[PDB]
Each structure stands twice: as C-alpha cells, then as structure tokens.
C-alpha cells in the first residue's frame, strides 16, 4: 500500500503545482496570452516556465 | 482630494472610440494591453475622474511618489486597469486663473490605495494646538492651483480618468462588442464563456 500511496501523493502534488502564480499575474497561460501583448507577456510566461 | 467614483456595470463597452477622441497626454494601460480591451469581459469597472497639473501626471502609477499621490490619491501595487489623461487648457483657460481646486500639503496618516480623503477640515501642522485658528504650527493643506493660459504649457490643467476594473471576481458583465455564436457539442472545439477561455 505504501507504494500506491506515495505514487498518488507525488502525482497529486505535481498536478496541483499547476495552480501557483510563482510571481506572475495569473496561473493559466491562456489568461495572460489573451490579456497581454507579447513584448510584455514574455517575462510572465518565463516566470511560470521556471 | 474629492474625486467622483462612477460605478459602471451591466453594458457592452468599447475602446476604439477612445483612440480618436483626442490625443491624450497619456493613455497607459497596466495589466492589460489597450489593444485587446474589447476582447475580454471585466467585472465591475470603476471610474475615477479629477483634474491636476500636467507635470504631476507621472505620479499616477502603482508605487510612485509625489505630494498628490501621497496626500490625495493612492493606487495599489497590484493595480489592473489603466489611466487616461489629457491637457484640459482650452476649456480651462482663465486669464485670471482658475482657483476652484485644492489639494493637500501634509496629512497625519498617508492614504491606503483607493480611499477617499473626506477629512477636508482644518489641519494641525505641529506644536501649539491651533484648534481651528490656522496659526503657528497649524497649516492649512488646501492650496489652490495656478491654472491660467499664461502659465507654463506643462502646468496647464489636465483632466484625468483612471479606469480601475478588477478581474475574475463574479459573473462578468462588461465585455465589449464581441458577437455571440451558435453552440455545438461532441467536437473538440475552442470556446469562450464570458472570458473563460479554453478548448
């Protein structure tokens, strides 16, 4: 059971990490993409990427 | 120090009409690209309007300094929206000078972002409690303006409005002229529901 539990916990943490701003103004790419021009969206997308 | 706050909601908006209205001194948008403003659906757009001196317009930004932006007006550091400002001199050209406006010199507590300074009464400056005599160490902060045509072109009166619209708060109501479209199912397609975008 420990194997299954640890794998599930790791997967859950990894997939939950998708909902953090990391400093950017959003947590979903499409928002920043439709809300900003590229010459500015570059830095935000870069923060999210790192 | 006394700015109107025109709460605006429940309509369809536009931006291009603000492109040919006038060559405003500054039309600067933070958090949103002024080109895409007619593509997303906001939530409870606000509207603050007032008139200042043309050189002070730089103070209107999230984290500037300046007597006006320190004792009259305050923006949050996470502001999302934008500022429009244009020289209003031809309509505010009083050769004797227009003196119907005032602003602060010093305040006990500096303002939080977006809080009205209704405390427009007598002000104490230092020691010797004046108790409403405007004597020594009790200075009236309300100083008039030098708005006249003979003044500097940079010191002319400027009309400013700051569209401060928050995002992702409620069922959106302020998106622009984007047209509706029939609805389909069971096909991997794009969509856009009140700004909520995806595929």
Swiss-Prot record, chain A:
Outcome following mutation: residue 21 to K: In strain: Omicron/BA.1, Omicron/BA.2, Omicron/BA.2.12.1, Omicron/BA.2.75, Omicron/BA.4, Omicron/BA.5, Omicron/BQ.1.1, Omicron/XBB.1.5, Omicron/EG.5.1
Domain of life: Viruses
Ranges in a coiled coil: 1-45
Described function: Subunit of the fusion protein that is processed upon entry into the host cell. Mediates fusion of the virion and cellular membranes by functioning as a class I viral fusion protein. Contains a viral fusion peptide that is unmasked after S2 cleavage. This cleavage can occur at the cell membrane by host TMPRSS2 or during endocytosis by host CSTL. In either case, this triggers an extensive and irreversible conformational change that leads to fusion of the viral envelope with the cellular cytoplasmic membrane, releasing viral genomic RNA into the host cell cytoplasm.
The name this protein goes by in its record: Spike protein S2'
Organism: Severe acute respiratory syndrome coronavirus 2
Designated gene of the protein: S
């Amino acid at each position: 059971q420990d194997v299954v539990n640890q794998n599930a916990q790791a997967l859950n943490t990894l997939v939950k990490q998708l909902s953090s701003n990391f400093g950017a103004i959003s947590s979903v790419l499409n928002d920043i993409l439709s809300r900003l021009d590229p010459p500015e969206a570059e830095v935000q997308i870069d923060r999210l990427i790192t | 120090y006394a700015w109107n706050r025109k709460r605006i909601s429940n309509c369809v908006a536009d931006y291009s009409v603000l492109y040919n209205s006038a060559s405003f001194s500054t039309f600067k948008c933070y958090g949103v690209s002024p080109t895409k403003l007619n593509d997303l659906c906001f939530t409870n757009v606000y509207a603050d309007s007032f008139v200042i001196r043309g050189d002070e317009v730089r103070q209107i930004a999230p984290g500037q300094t300046g007597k006006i932006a320190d004792y009259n007006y305050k923006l949050p550091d996470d502001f999302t929206g934008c500022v429009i400002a244009w020289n209003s001199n031809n309509l505010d050209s009083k050769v004797g000078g227009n003196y119907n406006y005032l602003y602060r010199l010093f305040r006990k507590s500096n303002l939080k972002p977006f809080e009205r300074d209704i405390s427009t009464e007598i002000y104490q400056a230092g020691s010797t409690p004046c108790n409403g005599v405007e004597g020594f160490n009790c200075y009236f902060p309300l100083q008039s303006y030098g708005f006249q045509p003979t003044n500097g072109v940079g010191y002319q009166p400027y009309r400013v409005v700051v569209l401060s619209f928050e995002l992702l708060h409620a069922p959106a109501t302020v998106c622009g002229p984007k047209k509706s479209t029939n609805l389909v199912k069971n096909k991997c397609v794009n969509f856009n529901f009140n700004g909520l975008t995806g595929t």
